[PDB]
Each structure stands twice: as structure tokens, then as C-alpha cells.
Write a protein that binds this ligand. Structure first.
Ligand SMILES: CC(=O)N[C@@H]1[C@@H](O)[C@H](O[C@@H]2O[C@H](CO)[C@H](O)[C@H](O[C@@H]3O[C@H](CO)[C@@H](O[C@@H]4O[C@H](CO)[C@H](O)[C@H](O[C@@H]5O[C@H](CO)[C@@H](O[C@@H]6O[C@H](CO)[C@H](O)[C@H](O)[C@H]6O)[C@H](O)[C@H]5NC(C)=O)[C@H]4O)[C@H](O)[C@H]3NC(C)=O)[C@H]2O)[C@@H](CO)O[C@H]1O
Length: 143
């Protein structure tokens, strides 16, 4: 059991001890800022560069509110999967939970399953979580 990151500053990048494993649950607890921009992202990536992001989870308070899910490989973005629902709210606290499964990530927001994202690259290669944009973080916890 890895220790939680408590009140990490954004932008944040942090090691996932042992990498993503089938059954690992990562919790991101925080607050979407009220008036500090219109997007944030949680990135599950290989190392610290961010050129290789297995899963980019990117809520955008733009064009009615939607969430982009995508993968970056060797610096190139793939085809976006957009969920045209926004489960977050500017100025409001959230609990965001990611469950790593064999074929996909399951993402719950505030106790409710929000989206799944099927793996495009091997998940075992992911050892870093990064968070950027319009968000303040209280904690990131593991397992
Ligand atoms: C309808 C349609 O088709 N529309 C599309 C749009 O959807 C599309 O928009 C793009 O869509 C994609 C998803 O598909 C994505 O949302 C794009 O957004 C960009 O995404 C990236 C990743 O989240 C952002 O770039 C990253 O930003 C952060 C800060 O916010 C950093 O700057 C990242 O760079 C890394 O920074 C690290 C931390 O500082 C650094 O690591 C550090 O290095 C230090 C030493 O130098 C030290 O060691 C330290 O300890 C260490 O942590 C990394 O080295 C550094 N990496 C690199 C490569 O230098 C950066 O990667 C980006 O901010 C974000 N942009 C926006 C606007 O949100 C989104 O643009 C568009 C465009 O494709 O096309 C339309 O058609």
C-alpha cells in the first residue's frame, strides 16, 4: 500500500509505486476551481515527460460541458472519446476513482460509474500520475 499524496500542488506529477496493476484503485479527491480556467486533466503516463499518456481524462467546462478521454503515444494524440456529460461542477469538491481492469479503466465520479476507457497501450507500463489545470487537490490515494 503506497502512501497517499496529501495536498499535492498542481501541476503535479507523482510515481505510482509498482505501476498500474489489474485491480489497483486510484482515488483523486479535490475541488474544481470556480474561476481559474475551463479544463483539467488526470494523466496516467509512462515516466515524467508526458509524451506517453496511456489514459488522459480531461473534463472541459466548454461548449456545454464534456469530458475527453484519449491516449498520447510518442507525443501524438489518438482519436478522442468524448462523453458529452459533465459530472463535475466549477467550485465543487469531487471524488474521482479510477479502477484498473484487464481490458479497461473504470472511472467513478462521486460514487457513480461515469465512463470506461478500453486500454490502447499496455497498462503495466504506466508508473506516473499527473494532474494539471483548473483543479486544487486534497489527496491522491492508492488501493
Ligand atoms: C474537435 C477537436 O478535434 N478538437 C481538438 C482538441 O480536442 C485538441 O485539444 C487537445 O486535445 C488533447 C486530447 O485529445 C489534450 O486535451 C490537449 O491538451 C493538452 O494536453 C497536454 C497533456 O495534459 C498538456 O501539455 C502538458 O501540460 C502540462 C502543464 O499543464 C505540462 O506543461 C506538460 O509538459 C511537461 O511538464 C512536466 C511538469 O512540469 C515536465 O516534467 C518536469 O520536468 C522538469 C525538468 O524539465 C523536472 O524534472 C520535473 O520534476 C518534472 O516533473 C515535462 O518534462 C513536460 N513535458 C514535456 C514534453 O516537456 C505538458 O505536456 C497541454 O497543456 C494541454 N493543452 C491544453 C490547451 O489544454 C488539447 O490541446 C486540439 C489540439 O490538439 O485539436 C482540436 O482539433
Amino acid at each position: 500500500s503506497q502512501a497517499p499524496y496529501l495536498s499535492p500542488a498542481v501541476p503535479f506529477s507523482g510515481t505510482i509505486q509498482g505501476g498500474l496493476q489489474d485491480g489497483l484503485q486510484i482515488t483523486v479527491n479535490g475541488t474544481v476551481l470556480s474561476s481559474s480556467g475551463t479544463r483539467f486533466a488526470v494523466n496516467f503516463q509512462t515516466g515524467f515527460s508526458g509524451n506517453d499518456i496511456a489514459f488522459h481524462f480531461n473534463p472541459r467546462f466548454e461548449d456545454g460541458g464534456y469530458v475527453v478521454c484519449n491516449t498520447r503515444q510518442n507525443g501524438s494524440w489518438g482519436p478522442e472519446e468524448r462523453k458529452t456529460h459533465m459530472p463535475f461542477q466549477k467550485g465543487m469538491p469531487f471524488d474521482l476513482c479510477f479502477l484498473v481492469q484487464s481490458s479497461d479503466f473504470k472511472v467513478m465520479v462521486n460514487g457513480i460509474l461515469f465512463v470506461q476507457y478500453f486500454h490502447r497501450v499496455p497498462f503495466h507500463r504506466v508508473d506516473t500520475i499527473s494532474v494539471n489545470g483548473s483543479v486544487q487537490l486534497s489527496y491522491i490515494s492508492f488501493q
